[PDB]
Design a protein around this nucleic acid. Structure first.
Lengths: 122, 173, 37, 215
RNA sequence: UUAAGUGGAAAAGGAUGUGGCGUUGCCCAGACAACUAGGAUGUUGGCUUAGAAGCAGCCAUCAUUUAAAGAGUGCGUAAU
RNA sequence: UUUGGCACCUCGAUGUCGGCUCAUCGCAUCCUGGGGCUGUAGUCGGUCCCAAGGGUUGGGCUGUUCGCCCAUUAAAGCGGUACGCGAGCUGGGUUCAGAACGUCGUGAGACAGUUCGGUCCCUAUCCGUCGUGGGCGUAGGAAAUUUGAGAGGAGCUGUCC
RNA sequence: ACGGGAUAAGUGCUGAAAGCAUCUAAGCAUGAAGCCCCCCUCAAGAUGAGAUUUCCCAACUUCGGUUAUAAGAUCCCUCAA
């Protein structure tokens, strides 16, 4: 459940560590985003060097929310923090190394590169 | 009514059956019944349907010509009938028969099916030219316009449905 | 179509008629097509 | 077509094909019978009348609706049947397919049938505009004295009045409401129950009218 | 007289939709449509202009196969 | 719907601007719908016509109406209803007592040019509205099931194969 | 976001007035998120007060008025979907 002004850790090696979200895109009046949804965001804390620099406006995909997801079998999955991965406006990442676990609902959105680069997919 | 003065309207081998408020016509391909008008009057001398207008008013003067043309059309279509012809100029644009109904393909995601009607006969020449034979002039014109409305002529190249002698101003866009 | 209170013939072929209580002009080309309104 | 009556028992969940979870409402459709057959030539419209839950016979010095009265007894006597709690009409059925005295069995419905379900809403009572309608509440700080009231109700001297349909407080609760295009999951003839996919209006042990959808 | 419910909201202007009043011209030597039957040529002759032979734009705008037509009314037109 | 002109009601008081809550109407149409023309190849676009059913974003700097910007959106329409709505709410603005800067004034003081601060009352009689009861009526009295003259509600839109 | 009808703009067929032509005058079609119907809910105080099924009916008595009383409700009491 990511709305405007939430802060997310970044789970790639693109260069950013902390990110603030500006907009949940989709339709007009869209308030909250969750796993698989794309957001636009700002980098509030970056790593030295790196591709992306603090103050940049970028697009990200949400992975491993805390208020996680229900599935059609009635199973649920949750995580302990909220995280995102920054993308290249083609569902591809700017980094080359995803960290932490990732949800299985990314396959339904054509994020196969992230799914492949990731460790354990749940 | 200058045309109403040409209102002899001699039938060749066809009957003319008045019934007062309406009139029926029967010939080779009979059954043409119409409620024409009451302000006008009619007469059959031997083999000539003469129509007359009263009072020399504007409305009667118009209705004279209208009724005369309608009667001539009805008898001529009962005798010889009418035929309306058109053609499909296009690439891959092809139509065909389906017994009584017609089928057409113009590059849509679905072909088109024309359901025939009474006193109407379609005729495909070479899957690019079509004729519609009938007795009702209004009916054949209506159906011709209906089928040509499916894909009218495109200006830039000419692709579409068009009559045998219709002109299409082609723009060099 | 060209709607305007001032309908006039532009070319000689462009004739003038009435339909459903409105003045129109009819020409072979449709750029001279007009009605009053 | 294909109408029946029942009591709402409760909600559970069931597992379908490929392990999918299905929330389900269980409905007891028991001892339904036909009491009357209305016709166009007599009543002006074709319909059957159905009675659902049997009650006690007539008794002298009876005070509750558990015991039938003489009119209800006579009405349920024509059809060789007992008196019933709830009686409702169905106009969507074919009237010739039914007979007076006939038993409407749950097996009229089978799995996969899309249905409409009608019933009275639960009941809440006198409620305000924030709950009875979806109105926004005012600020709770910054010096506000406007929290849960409704705002203005009209403009000014022009229209020196309030229009009708102004969404003020009042009673919210039991009104009949249909939900369209629910489906049947399965049928159990031994316990005489239907399982409906989803949720239906009303409290437990409350009447529901099930009938077939048009669309 | 009007055929719009004008009557029962204005104007510059635009059109036929009808009545009235005159003036005037068109005709069994057959009027006004519309069929088709002729469309010209020495000649674009000349400045001949991207050639153009109804058309960069100025024409020089003459006989007439003929009962009857123009150094082309006019569709046009890269020019035809 | 503006800035004004007039000075007809109201000075034994007709609450001033913004904002919140709640709406309702018009069309001179922002999106969606249908069409004609195009100096419309397609993709599109421009202009005109019909059309008011529904819908018409969240933030930064603004007292700010207004305006600029950031990100979206199918779209981020123009207006009216005492520049809708304070006996429904705030009180940022202006303007009352305090004080200060600049300017003007011999001065007391002024500007309206700036700045900090500065008390928003009311138990609803009638109409009205939202709900909910009692009485009587309806050619005998009752229980139940109903028809439906009318009335209200709903009406949006996208991406992908 | 469906589907039926009738329509707007607009496209037309036939066709005179006006031997031609013309979507129009008479006639025949098509045609929109807009109108009506279809969908949901309220609804005979709809004083026009409706319809169906079932139940009940006085001993006198112009069965009016009567004590009665019937079908049926209520008072009262235990309660809540």
């Amino acid at each position: 459940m990511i709305q405007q002004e939430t802060r997310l850790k970044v789970a790639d090696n693109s260069g950013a560590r902390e990110v603030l979200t500006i907009k949940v895109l989709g339709g007009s009046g869209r308030k909250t985003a969750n796993i698989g949804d794309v957001i636009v965001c700002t980098v509030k804390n970056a790593t030295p060097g790196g591709v992306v620099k603090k103050g940049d406006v970028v697009k990200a995909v949400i992975v491993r929310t805390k208020s996680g997801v229900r599935r059609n079998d009635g199973s649920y999955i949750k995580f302990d923090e909220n995280a995102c991965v920054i993308i290249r406006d083609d569902k591809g990442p700017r980094g080359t190394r995803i960290f932490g676990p990732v949800a299985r609902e990314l396959r339904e959105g054509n994020f196969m590169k992230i799914v492949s680069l990731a460790p354990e997919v749940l | 009514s200058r045309v109403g003065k040409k209102i002899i309207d001699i039938p060749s081998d066809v009957t003319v059956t008045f019934d007062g408020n309406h009139v029926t016509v029967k010939g080779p391909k009979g059954e043409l019944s119409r409620t024409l008008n009451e302000r006008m009057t009619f007469k059959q001398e031997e083999n000539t349907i003469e129509v007359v207008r009263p009072s020399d008013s504007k409305e009667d003067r118009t209705n004279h010509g209208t009724t005369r043309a309608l009667l001539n059309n009805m008898v001529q279509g009962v005798s010889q009938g009418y035929v309306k012809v058109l053609e499909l100029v296009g690439v891959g644009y092809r139509a065909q028969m389906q017994g009584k109904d017609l089928i057409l393909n113009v590059g849509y995601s679905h072909p088109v099916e024309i359901k025939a009607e009474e006193n109407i006969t379609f005729s495909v020449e070479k899957n690019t030219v079509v004729k519609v034979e009938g007795i009702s002039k209004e009916q054949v014109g209506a159906l011709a316009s209906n089928i040509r409305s499916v894909r009218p002529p495109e200006p830039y190249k000419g692709k579409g449905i068009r009559y045998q002698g219709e002109y299409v101003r082609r723009k060099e866009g | 179509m060209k709607v305007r209170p001032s309908v006039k013939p532009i070319c000689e072929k462009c004739k003038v008629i009435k339909r459903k209580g409105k003045v129109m002009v009819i020409c072979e080309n449709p750029k001279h097509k007009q009605r009053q309104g | 077509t294909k109408g029946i009556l029942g009591r709402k028992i409760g909600m559970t969940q069931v597992f379908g094909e490929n392990g999918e979870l299905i929330p389900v409402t269980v409905v007891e459709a028991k001892e339904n019978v036909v009491l009357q057959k209305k016709t166009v030539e007599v009543d002006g419209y074709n319909a059957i009348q159905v009675g659902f839950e049997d009650k006690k016979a007539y008794k002298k010095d009876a005070k509750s609706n558990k015991y039938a009265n003489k009119p209800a007894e006579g009405h349920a006597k024509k059809a060789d049947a007992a008196p019933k709690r709830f009686i409702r009409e169905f106009r969507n059925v074919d009237v010739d397919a039914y007979e007076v005295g006939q038993e409407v069995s749950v097996d009229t419905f089978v799995a996969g049938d899309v249905i409409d379900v009608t019933g009275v809403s639960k009941g809440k009572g006198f409620q305000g505009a924030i709950k009875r309608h979806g109105q926004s509440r005012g600020p709770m700080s910054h010096g506000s004295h406007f929290h849960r009231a409704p705002g203005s109700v009209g403009m000014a001297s022009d229209a020196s009045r309030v229009f009708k349909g102004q969404k003020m407080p009042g009673r919210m609760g039991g009104n009949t409401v249909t939900v369209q295009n629910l489906e049947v999951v399965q049928v159990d003839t031994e316990n005489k129950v239907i399982l409906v996919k989803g949720n239906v209006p009303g409290p437990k042990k409350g009447l529901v009218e099930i009938r077939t959808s048009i669309k």
